[PDB]
């Protein structure tokens, strides 16, 4: 069984400005098999309302999904994406570094 580790990107739909509604994306790709758990985190807690794209896949057969949710970026609030998958022995959390 060839299995592939997901690469994870957390970013916001537009350039973020404290105070105004927006959308936060967790884009996971390059993974195999397809079962994957994605939680978007607000201050270490898990947001209840989160939709995803329709499972699809790249030229190399590895899958990719987009998990997104509107949020309002204050200046203090911490945002991250947590992903577990069969190739990850330990959940991976990637932090939303706005000023990347």
């Amino acid at each position: 069984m060839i299995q592939r580790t997901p690469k994870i990107q957390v970013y916001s739909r537009h350039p973020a400005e404290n105070g105004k509604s927006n959308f936060l994306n967790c884009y996971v790709s390059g993974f195999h098999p397809s079962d994957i758990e994605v939680d978007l985190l607000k201050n270490g807690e898990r947001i209840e309302k989160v939709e995803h794209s329709d499972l699809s896949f790249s030229k190399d057969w590895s899958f990719y999904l987009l998990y997104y949710t509107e949020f309002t970026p204050t200046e203090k609030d911490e945002y991250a994406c947590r992903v577990n998958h069969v190739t990850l022995s330990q959940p991976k959390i990637v932090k939303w570094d706005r000023d990347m």
Binding site: Q9, S29, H32, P33, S56, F57, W61, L66, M100
Partner: protein, 274 residues
Amino acid sequence: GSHSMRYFFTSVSRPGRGEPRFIAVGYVDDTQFVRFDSDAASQRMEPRAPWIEQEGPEYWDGETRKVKAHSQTHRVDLGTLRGYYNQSEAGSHTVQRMYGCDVGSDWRFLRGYHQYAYDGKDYIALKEDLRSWTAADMAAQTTKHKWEAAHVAEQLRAYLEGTCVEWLRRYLENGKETLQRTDAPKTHMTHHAVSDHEATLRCWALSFYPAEITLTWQRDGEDQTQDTELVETRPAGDGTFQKWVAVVVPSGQEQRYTCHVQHEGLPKPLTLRW
């Protein structure tokens, strides 16, 4: 620019509870326009773009009909393939199928493709000229004979060279506001020094469509693509795309490193500096 139509199919066996999970999605270029999910309640092909929602019931009956049959086929392949490799029925296994067509700027047929994968690796593919199959291993080789005997390649070729191309043009026309747009990247730069003797320059491309792009750093105008750090083009989640490239640069020398941007939506390629 050039265009394409692609169908992507995935079927995942569930060892213990019957029916496989099956997800089918159709794309024109980077824009998803139809979907089927065997877990959803409608059990029909559903629209995902406005310019497909005008197609009548004949379309939706046909598209549900043919997407059901794709489902049933993969569901029987799952069992077959398990036999071919002699796997137990306790594991979960995946078949994926991808096919479609490409046209040029004059919407003229450029090429067809149709490939099939088992557990995330090539199983069997239609060759470039669309008359012959390439088989990954012994199992595929037996599938090659089946499909040669059923003239599957002949059916696909007629599909890919006519039907596929013809409906792509219809889609391209019906949805021309959106499918035929170019949005230029709104670009920009951000600077950052880790300590205070080397610096990281990130060059951003945002809100662009279509998704193809070139984002590169050059040294002294000479192409330096090894000390660079790029990400894959991601979806902004609204139908446009994002990408950035970054370089490490010894503080005080940035002026001979510039950003190079090409994209369909720009009248001329952009350059950047800090």
